[PDB]
């Protein structure tokens, strides 16, 4: 089965990735169901920054050969959806 | 004198990374004095803007000989010289 988990303060880097947000929270979510089997969806909640420091939401894309690249430390939320499974190992 | 990657906005990304304090610039060259394993280090200035901290430096590895991942959002400036480049194949 493909279990949508979340985990926070911890991520974990793929291959492909890249950057896109600028309001709405949940709505950058569906930024992956477009076609996007989103193996990780992740975000980085920010704003103690510089006056308006908003959401920056990260995706990225992994399991084959490369695993994982492991980020320690600062990072936000990473979840992982559905049709990611299905994608696991192209 | 070997393989010096500087690269400008853009973070290219291979395999290890790990994330130290850039307190003192100097600093994370110093993680290059304790071991010499480190490639190149992703800076980035975030500080002369509001955050009167400072801002972080990515120790990663693999340049060349990794999968080269090219992404954006949260790249400055990385970094590095060294000659331990030569292992960066195998």
């Given at each position: 089965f493909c279990h949508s988990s979340?985990?926070?303060?911890?991520?974990?880097?793929?291959?492909?990735?890249?950057?896109?947000?600028?309001?709405?929270?949940?709505?950058?979510?569906?930024?992956?169901?477009?076609?996007?089997?989103?193996?990780?969806?992740?975000?980085?909640?920010?704003?103690?920054?510089?006056?308006?420091?908003?959401?920056?939401?990260?995706l990225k894309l992994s399991s084959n050969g490369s695993p994982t690249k492991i980020l320690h430390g600062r990072g936000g939320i990473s979840g992982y959806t559905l049709r990611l499974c299905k994608m696991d190992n192209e």
């Open positions: 979340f985990y926070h303060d911890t991520d974990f880097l793929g291959e492909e990735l890249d950057i896109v947000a600028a309001k709405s929270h949940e709505a950058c979510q569906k930024l992956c169901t477009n076609a996007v089997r989103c193996q990780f969806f992740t975000y980085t909640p920010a704003q103690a920054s510089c006056n308006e420091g908003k959401g920056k939401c990260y």
